[PDB]
From a paper:
Our current research focuses on the Listeria-specific N-acetylmuramoyl-l-alanine amidase PlyP100, an endolysin encoded by the bacteriophage P100, which cleaves PG at the amide linkage between the first l-alanine in the peptide chain and the lactyl group of MurNAc. Our data argues that D1 is entirely responsible for catalytic activity, D3 is sufficient for cell wall binding, and D2 is necessary for full function of the enzyme, especially in food-relevant conditions.
The enzyme adopts a globular, mixed α/β/α fold, consisting of a central β-sheet (β1-β6) surrounded by six α-helices (α1-α6). The structure contains a single zinc ion, which is coordinated by residues His28, His137, Asp151, and His177, the latter of which results from the C-terminus of a PlyP100-D1 crystal contact. During refinement, it was evident that there was clear electron density for the entire C-terminal His-tag, which was non-cleavable and therefore not removed during purification. Thus, the interaction with His177 and the aforementioned zinc ion is not present in the native enzyme and is merely an artifact of crystallization.
Residue numbers in the entry: 2 to 181
Write the structure that this text describes.
């Protein structure tokens, strides 16, 4: 799947070194009324409270709001010290929009993991040494420093289980000539 990264990197962010480039975090906004543009404007003004690296939404748009391979304030202190990137899915009520949003979400999570040298697994293991794509839920369950459970409630409303999300991420990495 093809996408365009819109550069809206927030001016003035800290560029904190990671303890390791071990995770890519899978989020969603939990906001049934916001657009991706609303989310980007809000996070620009409120970055001191929280920020991620990327939004996905608005029909498979990507907006980058922070550089990767530095701390982002997205998932509590324990995940934030080990997250190469943090990718946040915006909501839609439109099935055509969602299919675009979701395909691009899966492609971007795999693209970032591959660039960081992180395995394409979902919610594997239990520690900061278990590299991979991690839901906010897995961070809450295994590391603490947060209680959020995204993105599974939202994916479930669109008929996508955790098992289906794992299999969809593997299908991106499993493409013929995805890698050497
Ligand atoms: Zn989250």
């Amino acid at each position: 799947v093809k996408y365009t990264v819109e550069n809206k990197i927030i001016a003035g962010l800290p560029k904190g070194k990671l303890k390791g480039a071990n995770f890519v975090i899978a989020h969603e906004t939990a906001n049934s009324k916001s657009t991706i543009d609303n989310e980007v404007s809000y996070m620009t003004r409120n970055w001191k409270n929280a920020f991620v690296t990327h939004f996905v939404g608005g029909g498979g748009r990507v907006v980058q709001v922070a550089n990767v391979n530095y701390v982002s304030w997205g998932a509590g202190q324990y995940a934030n010290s080990y997250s190469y990137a943090q990718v946040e899915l915006c909501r839609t009520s439109n099935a055509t929009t969602f299919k675009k949003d979701y395909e691009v979400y899966c492609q971007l999570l795999v693209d970032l993991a591959k660039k960081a040298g992180i395995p394409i697994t979902l919610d594997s293991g239990s520690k900061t040494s278990d590299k991979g794509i991690k839901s906010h839920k897995w961070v809450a369950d295994k590391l603490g420093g947060t209680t959020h459970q995204d993105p599974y409630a939202y994916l479930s409303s669109w008929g996508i289980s955790k098992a289906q999300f794992a299999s969809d991420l593997a299908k991106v990495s499993g493409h013929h000539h995805h890698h050497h």
